[PDB]
Amino acid sequence: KSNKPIIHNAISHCCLAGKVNEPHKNSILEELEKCDANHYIILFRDAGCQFRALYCYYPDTEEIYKLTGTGPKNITKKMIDKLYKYSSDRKQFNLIPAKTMSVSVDALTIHNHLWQP
Amino acid sequence: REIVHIQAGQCGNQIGAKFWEVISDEHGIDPTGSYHGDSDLQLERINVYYNEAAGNKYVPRAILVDLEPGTMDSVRSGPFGQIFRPDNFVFGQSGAGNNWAKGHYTEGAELVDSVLDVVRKESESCDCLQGFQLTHSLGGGTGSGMGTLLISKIREEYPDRIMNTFSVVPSPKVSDTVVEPYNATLSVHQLVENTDETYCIDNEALYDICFRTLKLTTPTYGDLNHLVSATMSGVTTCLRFPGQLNADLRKLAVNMVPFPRLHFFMPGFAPLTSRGSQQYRALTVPELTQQMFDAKNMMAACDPRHGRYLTVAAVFRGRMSMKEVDEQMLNVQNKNSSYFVEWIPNNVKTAVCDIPPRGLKMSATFIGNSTAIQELFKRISEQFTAMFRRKAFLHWYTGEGMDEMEFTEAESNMNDLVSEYQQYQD
Amino acid sequence: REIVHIQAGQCGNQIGAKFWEVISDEHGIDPTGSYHGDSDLQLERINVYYNEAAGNKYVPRAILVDLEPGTMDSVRSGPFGQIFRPDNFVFGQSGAGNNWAKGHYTEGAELVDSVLDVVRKESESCDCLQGFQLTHSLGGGTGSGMGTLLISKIREEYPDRIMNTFSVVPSPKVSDTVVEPYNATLSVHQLVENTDETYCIDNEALYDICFRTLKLTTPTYGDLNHLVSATMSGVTTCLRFPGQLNADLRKLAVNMVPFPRLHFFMPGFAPLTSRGSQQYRALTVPELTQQMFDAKNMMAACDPRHGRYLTVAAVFRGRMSMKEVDEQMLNVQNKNSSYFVEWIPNNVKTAVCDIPPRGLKMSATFIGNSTAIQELFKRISEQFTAMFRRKAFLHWYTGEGMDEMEFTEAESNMNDLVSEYQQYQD
Amino acid sequence: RECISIHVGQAGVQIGNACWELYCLEHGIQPDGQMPSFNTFFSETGAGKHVPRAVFVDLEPTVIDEVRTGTYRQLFHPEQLITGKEDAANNYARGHYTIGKEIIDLVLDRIRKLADQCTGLQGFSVFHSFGGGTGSGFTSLLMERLSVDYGKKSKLEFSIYPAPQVSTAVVEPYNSILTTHTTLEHSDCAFMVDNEAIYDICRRNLDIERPTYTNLNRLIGQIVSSITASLRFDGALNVDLTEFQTNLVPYPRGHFPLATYAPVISAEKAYHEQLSVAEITNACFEPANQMVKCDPRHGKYMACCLLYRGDVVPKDVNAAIATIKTKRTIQFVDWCPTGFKVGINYEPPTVVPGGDLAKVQRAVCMLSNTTAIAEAWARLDHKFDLMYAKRAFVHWYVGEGMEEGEFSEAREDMAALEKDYEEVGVDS
Amino acid sequence: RECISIHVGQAGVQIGNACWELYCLEHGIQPDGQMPSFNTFFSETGAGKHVPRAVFVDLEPTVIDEVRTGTYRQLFHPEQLITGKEDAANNYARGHYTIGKEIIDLVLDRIRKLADQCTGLQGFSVFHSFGGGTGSGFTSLLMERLSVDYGKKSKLEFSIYPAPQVSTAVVEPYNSILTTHTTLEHSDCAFMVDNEAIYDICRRNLDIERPTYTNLNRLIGQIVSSITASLRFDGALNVDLTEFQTNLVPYPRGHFPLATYAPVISAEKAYHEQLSVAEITNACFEPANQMVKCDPRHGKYMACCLLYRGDVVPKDVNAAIATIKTKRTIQFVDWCPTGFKVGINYEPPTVVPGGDLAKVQRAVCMLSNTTAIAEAWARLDHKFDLMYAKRAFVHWYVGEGMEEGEFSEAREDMAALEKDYEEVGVDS
């Protein structure tokens, strides 16, 4: 199981779609092929779904490590606030209730004080 | 739980014209889109097939694909084109001329971006999708040429939905072009990769059913597709209508498919009788399973008494008792267990729908998965190996930009597909 | 809260003739000025547009400006010139011949002193002013030439009122004179300085709307302006008619304009459908915002998927629920937030009017502010830099008394205006 | 003094469509809620109307659309009518994990409303199947959560076991292997229901040649009404369910009782009929009336619990106990000398207007723990090992992210299940 | 024994268009003023006719033309119908300083007429919004003058807070920053109303899929009628608003209570309904019934004031207090040990003929001070700091002569507002 085609279905259509975002995503699609992980998570600031960064979270002790983008290096399971997924028919992001985070979760958001101004 | 029926080619636009003829007649709807039926069964499940517009007008959720207006001009000028919106009428000019490389690679790709935009405009209007439906021929240049480009892009977009097509197996008796086995092998090279399942439909087998079993004189393409639409709507409405064994097609996709590349089905229609034996025959559950086991009632030219059944689906319609169903299902397994695979004791899936058909008190639909499907696959490959050497009419596709080692890979995938059946035959 | 619509040129006098056609028809008024409607909505807000004379005769508060009688001779001899007083018919002889320097500097100033005297005779007769309305073309020699002289003097007189015009963006397909980009650049050099806001209207974009979306054969200037008057009266009557979100244009001028020189709008008309899909389309709030986001329904030839939205106004008409409005407004922001500016989370202003239109149960009007407005500004400037070098037909305006470094300052103002969009695009 | 019935899957809801109609038969209850006199399955509103304590679970709306559009919908509440939108696709991993995770947040939230409404909760019962997608997956999802939340409540399941000859899906042995270890882990008592033995009861003891699932649930829930609704109703010996869990399950992992019932009289069989107490218990010892295709002759009896209805004289029961000890072909174990529990209710059993069962003066239910149950598990394991050898259908759960090593792990748990009957079967 | 309602802006008048109709529902009052028996919101004339104590403020005549030409205009007086001629252009500076200065000389003159007519004035309430032009600018102009003139009266505001996701104007955060410091300076009690949380109440607890501002003001003022008109009406425990200002606001700057109300029953939900005292208060603890998009779980409760209607038994309230203390997820502060004020009115709540609310025997209003309010202010500040960084829309007030240094000054006052919840939130 893997999130990588679903993540490639996400940012190529929802987040990084844009002619100005096209040089930005070209550094990212090559980076996903280098990564050995199957489970890919996208970083967001608020519920407005603004593409911040992308993470490599796995439900085991594999790292949260920031793959590409601007964000903190380590994100703890306390730091998460809301869990995100993708709808292919909607091409938007739907809300998930609080649960054990795993492969079916596609993205997240984190705490506001964890952001720096 | 909604289904889009994207129809492609001169064949599949003619085939599905008979299909939505049945669907409007099944629910008792005026040809302009106005409901005049009286059942809540005909009222609740409209959402699956029809888009209700203002003024009780139903937009059929079905897409017509061709590179020529000519097939769609007759359907529009004829009946049941009035219920269709002009957004379903998407075409170009001119056609590919039964050419795969023109419909898939060079010229047919230009219309698909307009076609898949309508798919996105339809799927955003849909509340909940369950799977997308297609119908073409394997020798269809605009049917299968554009279609393999479609399913490759939709599976890229929608991995979670049922991706099936209704492809027509090319008959050796029915020959239009000589590069038809070229078109079939290049399709299966992508149809195994891109589709979740499909059926095996041969017109030559349907030629026998009209005359030997139904005693009909002149089988026309509408009369053939009238039987196919009885099998097309015989399967998918059981997902819609209630029953004791409500058989989802995605439930059916799990139970019938043991290996994701082994997804080829043998359809069959059970209540086949002529009007002379209408006064001679009683309609019982053992009577239909007698005709479900009948090789003459199969929609593909294969010998299931030569092959071995991987999985069997038994789609049923009518007010049936569970005792008569289960005991008759067991007795066929007691009789002909040698035509089954060894490592599964129950190779037959039962599917009873409580909602009876119109006119008939009982009806049923056979779906089988046998190892004799590779027999027609040898008919394509042996015709392919003769054509591949002498390169007859190859310069037409060579000017399109096709490579010969790409054809060998499609041949090797056909060589793989036969050998996959050989691993599970014996 | 009254509005004067000063119409200038052969274009805007023909454009606004279609406008007051709608206004008399909106209130159900005889072509001689007699009210025959039956609503207090058609009875209370007469003061904003019409001057009631003795005997239930309504004088339209609109001024017709030209240096030729010919455009006004057809409207006066035709219908709806009978409601117009003879004081509205102010002209000279002869015309400028689409010349900016003749209409603004040498010959056109002689009539403006008579025209602005009528403005003072009208504004003293008014009870309360809210803003002054204009309409011309950017390639209008008598439309924009006299008009930039008007707005420069009225802003001197009345700084506190809404100073807007409805200027027509010149099309590269529509070529009448070669010094039309000379006339457009010299206008924007004063229209940014003197006006409070304006719209962006391109006839070439309207050519696509009539044929691709409405399926019409021969778009005439009346057929084009019939669509524009649906957008002209679609905005300003919401200031007049009551609603839950009563959107003043001066409230709209605050909410849509972040930088005082950046006051250019992208209008759009939402209920655009032909008469064939009249029996096929349901009129809902998600249906219209689907067509509000449609780039094909824009009144200016720009790509909003290339540009980025500064501010968005959503003018609505009809009995709509506040839940369906706000949730649909949010979902578009959830969908295409990349086409928005970063530093504002709500780039869409909602404007719901409770009063429904006539005939339509629901209607809406899109107003956008994108960074793609500079694209058509590059179309003028690149044509300007070619024309400025070779000095073709420059001796006509040179004899009028114009300087070349004055033209460079208008070019520098055009260069600054594009760069201001460049500062806020990315 | 209350409990809640739970119906998960297409199987268990179609059971509960008949059982709450059977519960309306218990007092002649109107479809709106009006009844003269009973709040154990019900909650009374201020208008004198009663709502069921029912949990209706199906991820398919179709069975839910059957319930909300039929009779007795005035009794039912949308809190009770819990529906899904996407099918589980007859899968355990989609029932337990993938599809059921978006609904269990609501479903557990609905139960905590209803358990707050209860005053003295005794427990609950779940109706489902072993080989389904919803009734095996989401049941494994739900019973895992209810055992964490409510540890000291009754955890009952009356579950349908598919026949080794009759199975409607090939993945029914492929689902039930992962289901059973999770089922044995959390449940306090679990029954098995084999419809093929029920087909034998209808064709011979009722002479019904055309039964459907409607007529099957009539006979099943009538036994359940003598099991559930009758033990609260007072008789000569009033015994509840809480004393059964001690006296029928003395084992850590032994709670698979065989539910039997053999007063089974057709409408024409009632004219030639006179049944005493011992004569019915002889028919309960018949292999045809065991409700599961098994052979009790080659199984070792751990316990024999008896539930009675109607015309019961306890002095005649003592003669019937000596009658059973006279007719011994039972192979009763030596770990308990003579533990034969009896439950007696004075009230006569009910008969549905519209069913094919005749009116009787007395009804006898018998519960038993036998060692012939593992032969039905032996049929399950041999089917699964052939599927595990060829690795057919394995991509439907590895595609869901399940492990092949977990699949043989539950087989060793299924092996550990058959070790439990071996430890009881060998030792004495 | 009297008070005056004030309606400023397009928001508050559309509230008061429903609320005075709700006050006619309190006694079945005819549109001319004829009523059998009550002079608190009214003044009785010599002909037995009553006029409202209502202040109608809008600079646009259009909303005023809606009032003067509709029903109940025989009740209304042209002294009450105060209209303007020029719009405030959705601006704070034009409402407070530029346009509002020509009207406030008349408006303050009208109030001194009506306050002279009152005998024992309790105070007033002002209905407006936070981000408007008239309801923010002129409200800041009016409340500044009323605190100077009448220092010892009640200064209430039931104000509408725009949603962080739903805002009808971009200047609504740009107006409310300057408004709030002036609001906190003068007001005695101020509420916040988030219509997005009201939309969630209509679509689920009433199942209204198409609400407008008319249907919103039906539900809002019905709560306000239990707040305002009911506390003068006698019950088992008659408590006025003057005791609330001490017992709910012990702070110098703490007077932002969360107004909640959760008996919310649709027309079809009443058929399956039995709500006791403690059951309603559990629904009041729900995040869906808070009327403001906030999370009460992560907020610290300073106080919990309760207003009751209809069928109230005080002995059951004491059990309901122990029920709340049993169900604690409240994080109640330690500065007050157990201060839980209760108000009880014997009279049942009213139901509008034409609304979608059902008739209930009892109604429970709950007031609370929580620390999750500043998270809604955190949404306001981050929007304003982006506008202050880019300096967008700043020319609309520099053109009015406002200072950019005052804009960040009120931000530090907005920061000092969030310090007040930090001083309560950290300390215990």
Ligand SMILES: CC(=O)O[C@H]1C(=O)[C@@]2(C)[C@H]([C@H](OC(=O)c3ccccc3)[C@]3(O)C[C@H](OC(=O)[C@H](O)[C@@H](NC(=O)c4ccccc4)c4ccccc4)C(C)=C1C3(C)C)[C@]1(OC(C)=O)CO[C@@H]1C[C@@H]2O
């Ligand atoms: C007096 C009477 O009952 O006449 C029958 C009849 O005698 C026969 C000949 C019918 C008839 O079918 C044909 O003649 C036929 C010819 C070519 C291909 C397919 C059908 C019938 O048309 C078919 C029709 O079946 C239906 O109406 C079903 O609902 C069917 N619908 C259609 O076939 C249909 C017809 C016209 C327009 C739209 C739909 C259906 C089946 C499966 C799923 C959905 C719908 C029936 C009862 C009859 C006639 C009229 C003669 C048979 O077919 C069916 C589907 O029942 C052919 O084999 C059976 C044997 C029947 O005896």
Ligand SMILES: Nc1nc2c(ncn2[C@@H]2O[C@H](COP(=O)(O)OP(=O)(O)OP(=O)(O)O)[C@@H](O)[C@H]2O)c(=O)[nH]1
């Ligand atoms: N006796 C009886 N058995 C039933 C009934 N309905 C289904 N079954 C049995 O249930 C089994 C099939 O399970 P399903 O109901 O299809 O599966 P499910 O648990 O509901 O879950 P899904 O597959 O996700 O829909 C078979 O053994 C059937 O005999 C019923 O009304 N009565």
Ligand SMILES: Nc1nc2c(ncn2[C@@H]2O[C@H](COP(=O)(O)OP(=O)(O)OP(=O)(O)O)[C@@H](O)[C@H]2O)c(=O)[nH]1
């Ligand atoms: N619930 C509710 N909110 C309303 C109503 N009318 C307006 N609002 C809210 O008020 C806000 C908009 O404020 P406006 O009414 O336009 O502004 P104003 O304070 O009246 O002043 P001006 O801008 O000068 O007209 C939004 O948050 C609306 O949701 C109403 O009847 N009910």
Ligand SMILES: Nc1nc2c(ncn2[C@@H]2O[C@H](COP(=O)(O)OP(=O)(O)O)[C@@H](O)[C@H]2O)c(=O)[nH]1
């Ligand atoms: N049953 C049936 N087969 C058809 C029909 N039209 C064409 N075919 C078959 O379809 C094949 C030719 O492919 P087709 O799809 O029509 O060509 P395309 O237009 O290029 O897609 C041949 O095997 C034909 O016999 C039809 O109406 N009915």
Ligand SMILES: Nc1nc2c(ncn2[C@@H]2O[C@H](COP(=O)(O)OP(=O)(O)O)[C@@H](O)[C@H]2O)c(=O)[nH]1
């Ligand atoms: N839509 C529209 N455009 C017009 C009309 N008349 C002229 N134009 C446009 O206006 C421009 C010429 O300017 P115009 O105002 O007519 O010249 P003026 O009389 O000197 O003001 C060109 O772009 C024309 O296409 C008209 O009736 N309708």
Ligand SMILES: [Mg+2]
């Ligand atoms: Mg089910």
Ligand SMILES: [Mg+2]
């Ligand atoms: Mg206002």
